[PDB]
Amino acid sequence: MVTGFINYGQQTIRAARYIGQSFMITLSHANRLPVTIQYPYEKLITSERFRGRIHFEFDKCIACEVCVRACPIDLPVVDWKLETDIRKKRLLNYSIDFGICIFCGNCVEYCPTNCLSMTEEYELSTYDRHELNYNQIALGRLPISITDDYTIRTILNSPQTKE
Amino acid sequence: MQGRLSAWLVKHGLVHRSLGFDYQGIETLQIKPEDWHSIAVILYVYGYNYLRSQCAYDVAPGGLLASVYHLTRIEYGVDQPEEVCIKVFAPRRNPRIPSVFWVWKSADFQERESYDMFGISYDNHPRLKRILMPESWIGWPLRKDYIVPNFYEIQDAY
Amino acid sequence: SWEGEGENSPMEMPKGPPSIISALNVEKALRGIGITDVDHYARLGLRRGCTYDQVGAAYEIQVKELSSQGMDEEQFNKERDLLKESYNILSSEQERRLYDWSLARNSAPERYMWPFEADITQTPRWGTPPPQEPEDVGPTTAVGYFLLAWFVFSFILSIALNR
Amino acid sequence: VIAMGACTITGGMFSTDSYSTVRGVDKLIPVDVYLPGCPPKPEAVIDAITKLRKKISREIYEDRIKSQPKNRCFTINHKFRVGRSIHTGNYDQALLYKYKS
Amino acid sequence: TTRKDLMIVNMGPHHPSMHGVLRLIVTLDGEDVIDCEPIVGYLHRGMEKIAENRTIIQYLPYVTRWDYLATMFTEAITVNGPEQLGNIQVPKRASYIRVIMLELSRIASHLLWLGPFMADIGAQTPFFYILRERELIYDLFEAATGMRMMHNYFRIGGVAADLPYGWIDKCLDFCDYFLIGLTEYQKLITRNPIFLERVENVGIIGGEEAINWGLSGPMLRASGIQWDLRKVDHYECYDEFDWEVQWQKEGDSLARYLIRIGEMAESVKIIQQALEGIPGGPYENLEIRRKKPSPAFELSKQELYVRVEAPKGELGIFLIGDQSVFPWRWKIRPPGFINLQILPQLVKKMKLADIMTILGSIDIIMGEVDR
Numbered sequence: 034m035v036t037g038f039i040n041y042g043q044q045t046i047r048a049a050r051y052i053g054q055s056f057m058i059t060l061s062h063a064n065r066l067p068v069t070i071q072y073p074y075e076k077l078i079t080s081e082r083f084r085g086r087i088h089f090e091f092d093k094c095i096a097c098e099v100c101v102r103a104c105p106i107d108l109p110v111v112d113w114k115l116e117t118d119i120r121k122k123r124l125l126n127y128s129i130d131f132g133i134c135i136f137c138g139n140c141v142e143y144c145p146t147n148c149l150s151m152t153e154e155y156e157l158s159t160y161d162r163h164e165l166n167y168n169q170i171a172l173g174r175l176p177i178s179i180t181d182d183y184t185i186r187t188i189l190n191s192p193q194t195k196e
Numbered sequence: 197m198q199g200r201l202s203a204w205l206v207k208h209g210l211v212h213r214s215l216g217f218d219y220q221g222i223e224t225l226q227i228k229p230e231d232w233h234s235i236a237v238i239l240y241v242y243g244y245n246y247l248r249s250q251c252a253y254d255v256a257p258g259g260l261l262a263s264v265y266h267l268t269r270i271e272y273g274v275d276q277p278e279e280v281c282i283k284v285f286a287p288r289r290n291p292r293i294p295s296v297f298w299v300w301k302s303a304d305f306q307e308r309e310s311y312d313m314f315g316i317s318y319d320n321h322p323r324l325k326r327i328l329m330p331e332s333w334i335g336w337p338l339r340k341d342y343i344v345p346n347f348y349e350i351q352d353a354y
Numbered sequence: 355s356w357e358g359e360g361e362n363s364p365m366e367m368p369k370g371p372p373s374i375i376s377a378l379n380v381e382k383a384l385r386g387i388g389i390t391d392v393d394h395y396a397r398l399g400l401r402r403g404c405t406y407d408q409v410g411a412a413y414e415i416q417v418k419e420l421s422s423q424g425m426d427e428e429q430f431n432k433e434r435d436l437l438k439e440s441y442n443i444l445s446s447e448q449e450r451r452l453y454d455w456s457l458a459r460n461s462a463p464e465r466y467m468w469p470f471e472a473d474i475t476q477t478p479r480w481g482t483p484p485p486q487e488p489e490d491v492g493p494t495t496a497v498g499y500f501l502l503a504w505f506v507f508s509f510i511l512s513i514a515l516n517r
Numbered sequence: 518v519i520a521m522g523a524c525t526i527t528g529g530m531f532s533t534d535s536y537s538t539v540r541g542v543d544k545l546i547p548v549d550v551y552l553p554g555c556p557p558k559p560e561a562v563i564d565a566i567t568k569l570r571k572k573i574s575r576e577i578y579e580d581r582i583k584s585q586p587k588n589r590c591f592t593i594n595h596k597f598r599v600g601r602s603i604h605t606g607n608y609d610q611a612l613l614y615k616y617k618s
Numbered sequence: 619t620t621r622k623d624l625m626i627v628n629m630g631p632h633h634p635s636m637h638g639v640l641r642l643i644v645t646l647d648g649e650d651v652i653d654c655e656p657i658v659g660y661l662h663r664g665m666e667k668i669a670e671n672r673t674i675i676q677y678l679p680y681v682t683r684w685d686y687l688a689t690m691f692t693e694a695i696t697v698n699g700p701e702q703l704g705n706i707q708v709p710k711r712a713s714y715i716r717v718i719m720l721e722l723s724r725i726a727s728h729l730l731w732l733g734p735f736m737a738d739i740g741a742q743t744p745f746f747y748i749l750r751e752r753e754l755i756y757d758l759f760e761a762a763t764g765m766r767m768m769h770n771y772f773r774i775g776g777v778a779a780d781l782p783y784g785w786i787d788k789c790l791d792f793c794d795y796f797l798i799g800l801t802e803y804q805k806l807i808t809r810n811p812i813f814l815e816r817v818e819n820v821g822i823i824g825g826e827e828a829i830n831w832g833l834s835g836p837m838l839r840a841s842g843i844q845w846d847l848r849k850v851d852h853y854e855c856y857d858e859f860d861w862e863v864q865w866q867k868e869g870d871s872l873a874r875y876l877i878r879i880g881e882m883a884e885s886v887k888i889i890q891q892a893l894e895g896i897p898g899g900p901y902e903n904l905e906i907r908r909k910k911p912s913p914a915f916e917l918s919k920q921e922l923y924v925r926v927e928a929p930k931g932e933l934g935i936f937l938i939g940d941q942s943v944f945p946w947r948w949k950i951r952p953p954g955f956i957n958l959q960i961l962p963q964l965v966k967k968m969k970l971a972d973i974m975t976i977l978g979s980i981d982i983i984m985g986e987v988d989r
């Protein structure tokens with residue numbers, strides 16, 4: 034009968050010890066520096082192959098439409114007409130709607146002229162959906178690098194390991 | 197070549213038909229729907245512990261509906277387990293295939309999927325109802341001749 | 355086209371003890387009807403749920419000790435065959451699985467019992483799991499000593515300050 | 518409302534062949550800020566929230582009467598067939614007696 | 619007590635414990651679960667129908683949307699179905715990279731299982747604690763593949779690109795840090811009295827029931843069954859590395875938790891062994907690599923079944939070709955969709971607060987349950 038009380042004692046002190054262990058493990062994180070990236074005052078530098086907004090070169094496009102076929106949804110719109118003087122495909126309009134785009138990278142990979150590139154330009158939020166229908170002028174704009182914005186602290190994820 | 201399971205069945209006098217092998221050499225047998233409920237118990241008796249997957253597919257549009265069962269053994273000390281594919285064919289007009297839920301419980305959801313996508317009705321399944329599609333839906337979407345009835349929210353975002 | 359193979363094969367169970375595995379026996383087991391009135395667990399002295407060594411041991415002691423001692427006539431020989439059925443039911447995994455499932459179905463036909471529930475080969479036998487890390491018990495004793503000293507100090511302090 | 522993801526703006530990858538995907542919640546709910554991208558970067562989510570704050574701070578009292586519904590209704594008899602719910606909640610109860618050979 | 623006493627509550631698509639949009643119609647008799655009915659399909663995008671009328675190079679982005687925690691496993695099964703159909707060999711370096719990525723995805727999936735599980739139990743801090751290191755895993759993936767999730771890195775007969783310079787040491791440092799993090803997790807959680815008393819004796823599953831129900835992975839291995847499809851099917855290079863199949867004898871949720879922790883540790887050992895013995899040579903198969911019109915992979919006219927050991931169990935693909943670019947039939951065998959069907963049996967005659975523990979014990983994410 035006494036052994037039951039003794040066992041109750043030893044199975045209560047153990048619980049108190051493990052509760053204190055949880056408290057100690059959690060409170061030991063107060064001595065460690067925060068990992069939080071303070072966006073938008075701090076921005077994480079994207080990788081060398083980050084897939085963001087498409088950049089399109091109008092002069093290098095041949096309207097071969099393989100970027101449309103390689104797309105999972107045939108998203109890019111290539112309006113072209115034949116220039117009968119030279120019988121080469123003349124590009125008239127190029128449009129990618131980023132409301133349907135998933136940034137898979139098939140267009141920039143299977144483009145034969147390599148006129149399509151992936152930039153670091155995320156954060157393409159707009160108030161209107163139809164403003165996401167970027168034409169050949171909006172796609173041709175150079176991306177704004179976060180290294181050129183000097184009001185924020187650009188954060189590097191890991192040491193450069195280039196040594 | 198005759199498979200191990202086919203040789204065992206012809207030794208025990210069970211009607212079937214061997215359709216060959218897949219790319220991995222797993223035997224493929226065809227079982228008539230009327231004999232499938234009796235043959236599933238005998239299949240477990242052979243030692244097929246594990247109903248790995250139950251699937252249904254369309255042989256041809258306007259044609260037969262095939263239900264596929266993959267079986268294997270889970271046992272201690274067996275190096276290479278024995279796996280078998282078995283297909284049961286039902287007509288499109290009124291597909292009826294007995295349920296193996298009373299042999300392997302793993303079919304419980306899966307046959308319902310086969311009912312939801314292709315309309316193959318399973319007899320002894322106690323809770324046969326649509327599982328993935330809405331419960332009030334009319335039509336079987338995965339059939340090759342299915343046509344979506346022009347819902348507004350499925351159309352293009354204008 | 356072709357034809358449905360194994361249409362009873364025209365020989366099937368050619369001589370010897372016929373297999374208990376059949377479509378009719380399986381249908382009888384499904385419906386809840388005893389497929390064999392003979393108790394094959396009897397005539398061997400075994401109990402229900404015995405392992406696969408006990409069936410062979412019972413075969414040995416029933417075919418060499420009990421039967422051979424009784425009579426020397428050829429009626430023993432057919433009696434040997436009378437044993438040779440039950441062993442061949444209780445030694446082969448498949449026929450024994452069918453037999454126990456039929457017995458379980460016949461016992462309580464109102465409720466359903468799956469074949470794996472009546473099978474004895476489904477019990478997992480894979481050895482021992484990798485042990486989990488050992489436990490540290492020293493801080494438990496430290497916490498217990500701290501609390502016991504706190505209680506004793508409470509007793510002493512209450513007695514001293516009350517006076 | 519913030520529509521995050523390409524599947525919430527216009528349906529995304531499922532805009533072409535999915536038979537059950539709603540192509541954008543703007544067909545269901547009025548969206549203030551559209552956030553493009555398949556898994557948008559969390560910084561892009563914060564940017565969309567920042568733009569939402571930019572629009573919120575511009576509100577006046579007049580916008581309140583732009584927000585209450587007009588609540589117009591029209592009621593008729595339908596002579597349809599009324600049926601009870603298929604999913605009644607009965608599941609795995611007395612299952613062993615549901616064999617019915 | 620049959621009706622007007624039994625409360626039918628629809629703990630449905632919008633519930634913090636419901637991982638995604640799983641619905642449970644739970645019938646309660648004073649906080650006692652009489653039974654529950656699972657309603658799924660609130661995320662059914664018809665992905666098997668979109669699998670047809672799409673080439674493989676077009677369908678690959680769609681693949682990561684089932685099991686979005688362990689994306690590399692789905693990508694691996696999608697790229698190894700047709701490459702087995704076409705008898706395409708994989709170079710050794712590509713196979714080692716695939717093994718490393720699969721084990722990293724298993725680590726991440728086990729982490730982001732542990733988070734919501736302890737959240738459903740009641741502890742919210744472990745969610746942030748796992749996210750601190752899952753962000754490091756995301757950083758490694760984005761450095762290698764180019765994105766955190768939806769990598770589109772696995773390819774038929776190889777991978778998209780070779781590992782970048784300075785990746786091996788970064789992954790080794792991650793492994794060294796993550797071992798310490800896992801020790802911290804086991805110190806904080808494993809012996810906690812409240813965690814044990816919430817977890818110790820819930821969801822006892824027999825081994826025979828686990829086999830019959832079609833369970834796989836940590837669910838099946840936590841019932842006394844040492845069944846791992848990495849060692850049974852001899853997948854990739856798993857026969858070359860020294861690792862142990864984590865299985866436990868008892869059937870409760872604590873066994874599943876211990877199994878997933880041990881699987882994380884064994885996975886870390888596998889990354890260490892693979893990075894120590896990485897081979898050279900090419901990664902993309904030069905035979906298949908060959909303005910001109912570009913066809914896709916034309917599947918052969920035969921059926922095929924391919925399996926993988928996903929962190930949630932066994933993920934399978936049943937592929938029927940039609941001698942064309944578009945497959946004739948593409949059936950997905952989801953581990954979570956089959957592991958979920960045992961939940962009404964487990965939660966029957968249990969309590970309301972135990973449903974969260976049972977459902978967190980099972981690694982269910984709703985994007986893989988339906989397709």
Ligand code: SF4
Pocket residue numbers: 093094095096097098099100101111143144145146147148149
């Ligand atoms: S693949 Fe490149 S060059 Fe060809 S149409 Fe597309 S963007 Fe133009």
Ligand code: SF4
Pocket residue numbers: 100103104105106107108109129133134135136137138139140141
């Ligand atoms: S990135 Fe992918 S989804 Fe977007 S336009 Fe290019 S191919 Fe289409």
